[PDB]
CSV table of N, CA and C in Angstrom, one decimal:
chain,number,residue,atom,x,y,z
Y,1,UNK,N,-31.6,-16.5,21.2
Y,1,UNK,CA,-30.3,-16.9,20.7
Y,1,UNK,C,-29.0,-16.6,21.7
Y,2,UNK,N,-27.8,-17.1,21.1
Y,2,UNK,CA,-26.6,-16.8,21.7
Y,2,UNK,C,-25.4,-16.1,20.8
Y,3,UNK,N,-25.6,-14.8,20.6
Y,3,UNK,CA,-24.5,-14.2,19.7
Y,3,UNK,C,-24.6,-12.8,19.9
Y,4,UNK,N,-23.7,-12.1,20.5
Y,4,UNK,CA,-23.8,-10.7,20.7
Y,4,UNK,C,-22.9,-9.9,19.8
Y,5,UNK,N,-23.0,-10.3,18.4
Y,5,UNK,CA,-22.0,-9.6,17.3
Y,5,UNK,C,-20.7,-9.9,17.6
Y,6,UNK,N,-20.3,-11.4,17.5
Y,6,UNK,CA,-19.1,-11.9,17.9
Y,6,UNK,C,-18.8,-13.1,17.0
Y,7,UNK,N,-19.0,-12.9,15.5
Y,7,UNK,CA,-18.7,-13.9,14.5
Y,7,UNK,C,-18.6,-13.4,13.3
Y,8,UNK,N,-17.9,-12.4,12.8
Y,8,UNK,CA,-17.9,-11.7,11.7
Y,8,UNK,C,-16.6,-10.6,11.7
Y,9,UNK,N,-15.6,-11.2,10.9
Y,9,UNK,CA,-14.4,-10.4,11.0
Y,9,UNK,C,-13.3,-11.0,10.0
Y,10,UNK,N,-13.9,-11.5,8.8
Y,10,UNK,CA,-13.0,-12.2,7.9
Y,10,UNK,C,-12.4,-11.3,6.8
Y,11,UNK,N,-12.5,-10.0,7.0
Y,11,UNK,CA,-12.1,-8.8,6.2
Y,11,UNK,C,-12.9,-9.1,4.7
Y,12,UNK,N,-14.3,-8.9,4.9
Y,12,UNK,CA,-15.1,-9.2,3.6
Y,12,UNK,C,-14.9,-8.2,2.5
Y,13,UNK,N,-15.1,-6.7,2.9
Y,13,UNK,CA,-14.9,-5.6,2.0
Y,13,UNK,C,-14.7,-4.6,2.9
Y,14,UNK,N,-15.6,-4.3,3.9
Y,14,UNK,CA,-15.5,-3.2,4.9
Y,14,UNK,C,-16.1,-1.9,3.9
Y,15,UNK,N,-17.0,-2.4,2.8
Y,15,UNK,CA,-17.5,-1.0,2.1
Y,15,UNK,C,-16.6,-0.7,1.0
Y,16,UNK,N,-15.4,0.0,1.8
Y,16,UNK,CA,-14.4,0.5,0.9
Y,16,UNK,C,-13.0,-0.2,1.3
Y,17,UNK,N,-12.9,-1.6,1.0
Y,17,UNK,CA,-11.5,-2.4,1.1
Y,17,UNK,C,-10.4,-2.0,0.2
Y,18,UNK,N,-10.6,-2.5,-1.0
Y,18,UNK,CA,-10.0,-2.2,-2.2
Y,18,UNK,C,-9.9,-0.9,-2.8
Y,19,UNK,N,-9.1,-0.7,-3.9
Y,19,UNK,CA,-9.2,0.8,-4.4
Y,19,UNK,C,-8.4,1.6,-3.6
Y,20,UNK,N,-7.7,1.1,-2.6
Y,20,UNK,CA,-7.1,2.1,-1.9
Y,20,UNK,C,-5.3,1.8,-2.1
Y,21,UNK,N,-5.2,2.5,-3.3
Y,21,UNK,CA,-3.7,2.7,-3.6
Y,21,UNK,C,-3.4,1.2,-3.9
Y,22,UNK,N,-3.4,1.0,-5.5
Y,22,UNK,CA,-3.0,-0.4,-6.0
Y,22,UNK,C,-2.4,0.1,-7.3
Y,23,UNK,N,-3.1,0.6,-8.2
Y,23,UNK,CA,-2.7,0.8,-9.5
Y,23,UNK,C,-1.2,1.5,-9.5
Y,24,UNK,N,-0.9,2.3,-8.4
Y,24,UNK,CA,0.3,2.9,-8.4
Y,24,UNK,C,1.3,1.8,-8.0
Y,25,UNK,N,1.1,0.9,-7.0
Y,25,UNK,CA,2.1,-0.2,-7.0
Y,25,UNK,C,2.2,-1.0,-8.1
Y,26,UNK,N,1.3,-1.1,-9.0
Y,26,UNK,CA,1.2,-1.8,-10.1
Y,26,UNK,C,1.7,-0.9,-11.4
Y,27,UNK,N,2.7,-0.2,-11.3
Y,27,UNK,CA,3.3,0.7,-12.2
Y,27,UNK,C,4.5,1.5,-11.7
Y,28,UNK,N,4.4,1.9,-10.5
Y,28,UNK,CA,5.7,2.8,-9.7
Y,28,UNK,C,6.7,1.9,-9.7
Y,29,UNK,N,6.3,0.8,-9.0
Y,29,UNK,CA,7.5,-0.2,-8.7
Y,29,UNK,C,7.9,-0.8,-10.2
Y,30,UNK,N,7.1,-0.8,-11.0
Y,30,UNK,CA,7.4,-1.5,-12.4
Y,30,UNK,C,8.7,-0.5,-12.8
Y,31,UNK,N,9.0,0.6,-12.5
Y,31,UNK,CA,10.1,1.3,-12.9
Y,31,UNK,C,11.0,1.4,-11.9
Y,32,UNK,N,10.5,1.4,-10.6
Y,32,UNK,CA,11.5,1.5,-9.5
Y,32,UNK,C,11.9,0.0,-9.0
Y,33,UNK,N,11.7,-1.1,-9.9
Y,33,UNK,CA,11.8,-2.1,-9.7
Y,33,UNK,C,13.6,-2.6,-9.4
Y,34,UNK,N,14.2,-2.2,-10.4
Y,34,UNK,CA,15.5,-2.3,-10.6
Y,34,UNK,C,16.4,-1.2,-11.1
Y,35,UNK,N,16.5,-0.2,-10.2
Y,35,UNK,CA,17.1,1.1,-10.6
Y,35,UNK,C,18.7,0.9,-10.7
Y,36,UNK,N,19.3,1.2,-9.7
Y,36,UNK,CA,20.7,0.9,-9.7
Y,36,UNK,C,21.4,1.9,-8.5
Y,37,UNK,N,21.1,3.2,-8.7
Y,37,UNK,CA,21.7,4.0,-7.5
Y,37,UNK,C,20.6,4.2,-6.5
Y,38,UNK,N,20.2,3.3,-6.0
Y,38,UNK,CA,19.2,3.2,-4.9
Y,38,UNK,C,19.6,4.4,-3.9
Y,39,UNK,N,18.6,5.0,-3.2
Y,39,UNK,CA,18.7,6.0,-2.2
Y,39,UNK,C,19.4,5.3,-0.9
Y,40,UNK,N,20.3,6.2,-0.6
Y,40,UNK,CA,21.1,5.7,0.6
Y,40,UNK,C,20.7,6.9,1.7
Y,41,UNK,N,20.4,8.0,1.4
Y,41,UNK,CA,20.1,9.1,2.3
Y,41,UNK,C,18.9,8.8,2.8
Y,42,UNK,N,17.6,8.7,1.9
Y,42,UNK,CA,16.3,8.6,2.2
Y,42,UNK,C,15.8,9.8,3.1
Y,43,UNK,N,14.9,10.6,2.3
Y,43,UNK,CA,14.2,11.6,3.1
Y,43,UNK,C,15.3,12.7,3.6
Y,44,UNK,N,15.8,13.5,2.3
Y,44,UNK,CA,17.1,14.2,2.4
Y,44,UNK,C,16.5,15.6,2.0
Y,45,UNK,N,15.3,15.5,1.0
Y,45,UNK,CA,14.9,16.7,0.6
Y,45,UNK,C,13.7,17.5,1.6
Y,46,UNK,N,12.9,18.1,1.0
Y,46,UNK,CA,12.0,18.9,1.7
Y,46,UNK,C,10.7,17.9,2.4
Y,47,UNK,N,10.0,18.3,3.3
Y,47,UNK,CA,9.1,17.5,3.6
Y,47,UNK,C,7.8,17.3,2.7
Y,48,UNK,N,7.6,18.5,1.9
Y,48,UNK,CA,6.5,18.6,1.0
Y,48,UNK,C,7.3,19.1,-0.3
Y,49,UNK,N,6.8,18.4,-1.4
Y,49,UNK,CA,7.3,19.1,-2.7
Y,49,UNK,C,8.8,19.1,-2.8
C-alpha cells in the first residue's frame, strides 16, 4: 500500500480531548459576564493565592 500514517488528524478525541476545563467556563463567566468595575490593573496581586 501507499500510506505511511499521513491521513488522520481531524481532532477525533485524542483519548482525552474534552473534559479539560469547561464547566468552569459554563458558570464562572455566567457571573463575570457583566460586572461593572472591570479590572484595569490586571495581575496586581500576588502570583499565587
